Symmetry: D2
């Protein structure tokens, strides 16, 4: 029905976008970037991430599709050569939807801000040492000293989380994963070390010890937050929906990206 | 109703066992180690593991309880001082049950053997190099060369899995986790490296490349298997049930064991 | 002969400093913080690091001593109770000196700046992605994409380097060690992963790929450098000298700090 | 002068060997596999390792050369196409020698056995738990519980040591590196975790706690030792010598093997 297309903005992606719009013009399809029902991202995973955040207030009404004009992306998992086939199948419709879990981040001050992540949310200090108390379902778990912390969605586990030693999780698992960035461990300072995987309805709370200023990232976006009293992580009730047109299993996607393609 | 008690076999555990039996004699409780409904393990996690495997054919009819006479165990999570309180609460009954997921291992030859794991199942070679093809839901994922592989239950993630870099997973997540033991990675040999977390109904199959003899462990038990054609891992449909009498959250149990107690 | 004493600045360290000065007044010892021959640091390792950098232009004329008024430090390895014994032994003299290797960092622009490190020097980006070409003795070794890189002295290996997975090296080895911070590794991006240990006279050069702005740290000090053409690492020809009065072996120091004391 | 050639034993390596012998027949070169001065290994690193151990009692009289008929090896670093060039340059002589450090392993019982390693020596248990006390220069450093331990030469650091998280060390550094295999770390059990790098004249001693039977490997060779009282590691005074005919820097060799070739 209603659809829009975002572009990475290079020549290859802009022209693929115009060609798909022309191809869409031959069906009962209406270009609408205010209330689209299909969002096509042409570029890479960064382009797809921006498309998700552009429309994160209408996630239940939108099915996303990614086309990678560079190397294979984990979200942009369609090749440009299949664009005409994609146009045809999209126009007809009757496609199945698959849903991936998302991460909710709440930042409290001394007022509240909430953010939704498709990959992950990270916390680092403003410049000095990073020290937070990690509280799991109101239980004090550890005092973390180090570079920072990363809380990843399942589909995010192949991104920053992977570089930090985290496990790769199949996205059908409604969970979030917390990994450490360079923790100090000696006689007096102790962290768990291992990645931690949390189910739905578990709340991980980060509470400042001394400094209350933190650089908080949500996917690409990174903002300095001041006078922070708490950072709360939990699996969101909201999910992102993908239009699926053929089988591209997650573990094959992992294989193609990290082992060989 | 019917109950039995296993002991580590040292003086401390044998006498605690006899005292609980005497205390149980004052209620409508019958000692039966053929068809018990409550299985009390007195000792450590190894003692608890043997109790589980002693009765793994009646898991749906049994609630397990562990008493640790040494350091705190992840399964034997009751102190000996609470034994009298445990007797009293057990006798009355009306206790809630909590269930943890289990791992099913199938070993095929050229005939079939199946095993149930509460912690993990590992595969190593008989002596020479270990090389297996890793197949996920019939998709060839990687050729693994190294010391071996470990497939862990959620409650097993704090055991061997943790020492191999795996993530700690809350046991409410029905999953299994595959970690690598010292993989070779160079130009010609590529593994994923990261731990992999699999949901229910995903089948991980290990298939020999040259040598077909493997040392396979299931919890404590380790057996040399010969003429192996395939090793299949999946989350079991069977679950282990614990009698719960108070709140001892998993993440607090993790905290008490690895951070401080 | 000539000596000075730096203090962490809390009450405990200031008063210990005044007491040692009073005790030194009973010997042929002259307080001189312009050209001291003995530099006593009272506080922690951060205090010792500042003392080293305060006098890094007279390293060949100075023997350093650290007193830890908090937990045991790797550089401040004397307890406050031994201060009177230290005064007496220092005044007499005839102490042996031990030398630790240092790291030289050269930053080139489009002009040159050089820095000396006792712990390590790290490179991170100004905000966006960090991408550098790593060149070893003029040989292009890898293109590094990730959070950053850390080059550690031997005595620094128990500090940031340790938290990044680096090896602990005995300080008698004239070397530097390069560790990765969260590198991306997929089909198209490849780093070595492993820590790299370099002997004297090997030059590791970091060369920008796109962005030329970098946040460069040397021990505690962190500075944003702009218009960087190259960052060069090599083991310095200069060494830091410690006054030794009893045996405190490095591996015992490692044991006391990380295993138990 | 005197020379011999070992072969992997496949058709490619046997015929290359015969062709080099025929080519050597045109110079003042004598085939002697009793007291050779040049040892040519044709095959892979395993073939080279066997050549080293075949002649480990005449290391000071022998210069080794490796030809890799498969993928590039770290010791067999010459291609078969250069065999004729190698024959010519070898016959003339006047080649430079480069030396790599070696590892000495002493096994004491209740009698003594000593072994020389070019890659590494590892210790594992006979079947049950592996527990040893790690003693560094007579100082008790840690009690290690886990799968085992690996002590690597510098040139060995790119082999098993690399798969265990160890650092890659340039072979001009006279050192040995100790890495852990899956150590248990909790409240009651503590190891250092990090790889440890030891200079010449440091002695690392492994002492049994309960079981005295250990599976000890030296390069390819693996032997069950019984009634072990101590395992002692130190950098050997003996070195292996390579004939060098052109520049093939170690870090380029690392690059070609792990990054790209
Ligand atoms: N260019 C602006 C936006 C950059 N990123 C977009 C992305 C992405 C992504 N998501 C992936 C996924 N779920 N599974 C596997 N692949 C996934 N990709 C892949 O990652 C690559 C791109 N990303 C990248 O170079 N970032 C470095 C960076 C650092 C600082 C600022 C900006 C960029 C590409 O190949 C794509 O295919 C944003 C995402 O970087 C991830 N990120 C951040 N820091 C690191 C790190 N140190 N190591 C690994 N990933 C990191 C993080 O997770 C974030 O959401
Ligand atoms: N004694 C015969 C039986 C030994 N093990 C019993 C157990 C256990 C256990 N389960 C735990 C859990 N889910 N979460 C946290 N804690 C858990 N425990 C804790 O682990 C300790 C005991 N186990 C141990 O020293 N094993 C070494 C070993 C090697 C070879 C043969 C026999 C023993 C104790 O403190 C207990 O509290 C069996 C279990 O060893 C685990 N295991 C095996 N190898 C390693 C390793 N290299 N690193 C870490 N764990 C290992 C594995 O996972 C197995 O199921
Ligand atoms: N307070 C201002 C100055 C802080 N640091 C002083 C120091 C130190 C030190 N040197 C040590 C050594 N050679 N071997 C073992 N112990 C050694 N110490 C020990 O490290 C602790 C102190 N340092 C620390 O919390 N820093 C966190 C930090 C981050 C950002 C800004 C400021 C501080 C103390 O216990 C002492 O005993 C400076 C040194 O931090 C090291 N550092 C930096 N980031 C990390 C990290 N993520 N993980 C581990 N170390 C880190 C680095 O290496 C630097 O030179
Ligand atoms: N085939 C009989 C003999 C096998 N090995 C010969 C070798 C070698 C070698 N030395 C290398 C070096 N210094 N730097 C880089 N490359 C180096 N190679 C490379 O390693 C590959 C070969 N080796 C291998 O598959 N071994 C697995 C194995 C396990 C159990 C029994 C037999 C073999 C090849 O590509 C070659 O190019 C012996 C050496 O295996 C090393 N080894 C042992 N276990 C592991 C492991 N889990 N992970 C990584 N290496 C391991 C160890 O270190 C030993 O000395």
């Amino acid at each position: 029905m209603k659809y829009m297309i975002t572009s990475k903005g290079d020549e290859k992606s802009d022209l693929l976008r115009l060609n798909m719009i022309a191809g869409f013009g031959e069906y009962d399809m209406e270009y609408d970037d205010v209330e689209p029902e299909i969002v096509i991202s042409i570029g890479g995973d960064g382009t797809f991430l921006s498309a998700f955040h552009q429309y994160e207030e209408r996630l239940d009404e939108i099915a996303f599709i990614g086309i990678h004009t560079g190397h294979l992306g984990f979200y942009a998992d369609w090749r440009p050569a299949e664009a005409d086939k994609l146009v045809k199948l999209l126009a007809k419709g009757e496609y199945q939807k698959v849903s991936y879990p998302l991460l909710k981040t709440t930042v409290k001050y001394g007022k509240e801000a909430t953010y939704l992540a498709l990959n992950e949310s990270t916390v680092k200090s403003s410049g000095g040492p990073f020290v937070v108390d990690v509280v799991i379902n109101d239980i004090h778990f550890e005092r973390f000293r180090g570079d920072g912390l990363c809380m990843s969605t399942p589909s995010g586990t192949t991104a920053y989380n992977k570089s930090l030693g985290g496990a790769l999780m199949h996205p059908s698992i409604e969970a979030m994963q917390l990994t450490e960035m360079a923790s100090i461990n000696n006689r007096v300072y102790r962290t768990i070390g291992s990645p931690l995987v949390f189910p739905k309805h578990h709340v991980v709370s980060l509470q400042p010890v001394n400094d209350k200023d933190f650089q908080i990232s949500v996917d690409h976006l990174s903002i300095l937050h001041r006078d922070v009293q708490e950072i709360r992580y939990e699996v969101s009730a909201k999910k992102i929906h993908f239009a699926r047109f053929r089988s591209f299993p997650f573990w094959r996607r992992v294989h193609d990206s990290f082992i060989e393609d």
